[PDB]
Design a protein around this ligand. Sequence first.
Ligand SMILES: C[S@@+](CC[C@H](N)C(=O)[O-])C[C@H]1O[C@@H](n2cnc3c(N)ncnc32)[C@H](O)[C@@H]1O
Length: 327
Amino acid sequence: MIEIKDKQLTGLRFIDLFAGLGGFRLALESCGAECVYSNEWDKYAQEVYEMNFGEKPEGDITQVNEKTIPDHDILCAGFPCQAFSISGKQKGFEDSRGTLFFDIARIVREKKPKVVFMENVKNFASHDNGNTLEVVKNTMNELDYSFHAKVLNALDYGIPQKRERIYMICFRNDLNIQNFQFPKPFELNTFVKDLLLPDSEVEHLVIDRKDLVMTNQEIEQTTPKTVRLGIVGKGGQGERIYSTRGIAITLSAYGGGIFAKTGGYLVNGKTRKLHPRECARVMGYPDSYKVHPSTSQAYKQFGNSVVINVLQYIAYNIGSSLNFKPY
DNA sequence: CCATGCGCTGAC
DNA sequence: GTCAGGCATGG
Ligand SMILES: C[S@@+](CC[C@H](N)C(=O)[O-])C[C@H]1O[C@@H](n2cnc3c(N)ncnc32)[C@H](O)[C@@H]1O
């Protein structure tokens, strides 16, 4: 995460729905906003969130009466993606985990925040022949919000991970915001190798498979792209090895393979997965963030989370637009 | 609860 | 052609 000098969201209150690790909280709080409610139902996520923020989020949002939600200016929601990912069945709204958007809508109808700030997987934009995004747009428009949606790749915003996500920013119509812009990409100057822990700290993560096939020569020049060097097994998910002179593959919550959830990396002649602290870094979490004591739940949590830096640039732009109020 | 071998979708 | 992105069943 990045330093924010000019606190564009000072005086604003936000709610942290589907809170997970609290990435939206770190992002908005860095721009000066104050969290007034969080909701997250997973027991272990609630533990890490409490460890880090001092409060337990409320549980199952589907059972929460929207009248009881504190007044707020910005609603944040990285809602579940398993029903929309190209890695799963794509059942969308037919999946239990696919209809959480309508709980957001329910809350928005009652609370009417200034801004609604959502994230999902890149494929949310293409799912069900575009009808999924269409429904979202139409829902927000009928709630009296504008709808701004763009897929951003983390590697364009200072973070060495190929994580493409759709970001959805909605402004209440009475505010008349006409100048919201998604942040402009810039050159990447940080690579996986720059975020790695000392070899002494990660010996236990080294995997030595006898069926490793090294397909490509290691690179000396750093590059803002993934660079696959070899595979194990049949080369499915978690069976692929990358150069640390490129960027990380997308971290995943439920991913399998021998290099599950992180992917494999060539480091000093050996292949290993990433440490949870390296996953934290690849998601833009500060080293001060406290990781869950279950390494298993930690990998799951970072794989489900958001890239903090990207949310920081967007939040700053939302603040810039809200504060532009000439006579 | 965790591990890991898919399995096939998307997108070039 | 070249690749990257959760589910099932085992323990
Ligand atoms: C994919 S992630 C969000 C990650 C978050 N943006 C971050 O900074 O870590 C979705 C989260 O929604 C939670 N979730 C799913 N269904 C829920 C429900 N019905 N009520 C509350 N939380 C739910 C999941 O446990 C998961 O942590």
